[PDB]
């Protein structure tokens, strides 16, 4: 809008249940965070980790996750401000089960 950016914000929480001999079918990308300054989420940059890619037809894809989704929670733990290695460890904790909350942000262009 004339006074600032407008965004569509869509939250998605999914329960992923994979087989032993497959992956969940996504690549997580994000920061490893600085103790010096707290991360402040914004609509454009809502979390430190996001889905760099999602395998079409894979487990995550079939549940509704998409490339570009930002990761908010893993198995009931908030990860908005959490570094990459800890989030990886949290995801691996559940084995073949992973429940995540992500958010998809789309900036509605004015022109």
């Amino acid at each position: 809008g004339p006074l600032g950016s407008d965004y569509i914000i869509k939250e998605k929480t999914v329960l992923l249940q994979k087989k032993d001999s497959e992956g969940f079918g996504f690549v997580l990308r994000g920061a490893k965070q600085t103790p010096i300054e707290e991360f402040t989420p914004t609509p454009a940059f809502p979390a430190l980790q996001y889905l760099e890619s999602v395998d079409e037809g894979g487990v995550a894809w079939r549940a509704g996750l998409r490339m570009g989704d930002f990761l908010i929670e893993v198995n009931g733990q908030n990860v908005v401000k959490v570094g990459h290695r800890q989030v990886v460890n949290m995801i691996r904790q559940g084995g073949n089960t992973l429940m995540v909350k992500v958010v998809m942000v789309t900036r509605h262009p004015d022109m």
Partner: peptide, 6 residues
């Protein structure tokens, strides 16, 4: 940034 496939 790091990345990890799942």
């Amino acid at each position: 940034e790091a990345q990890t496939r799942f």
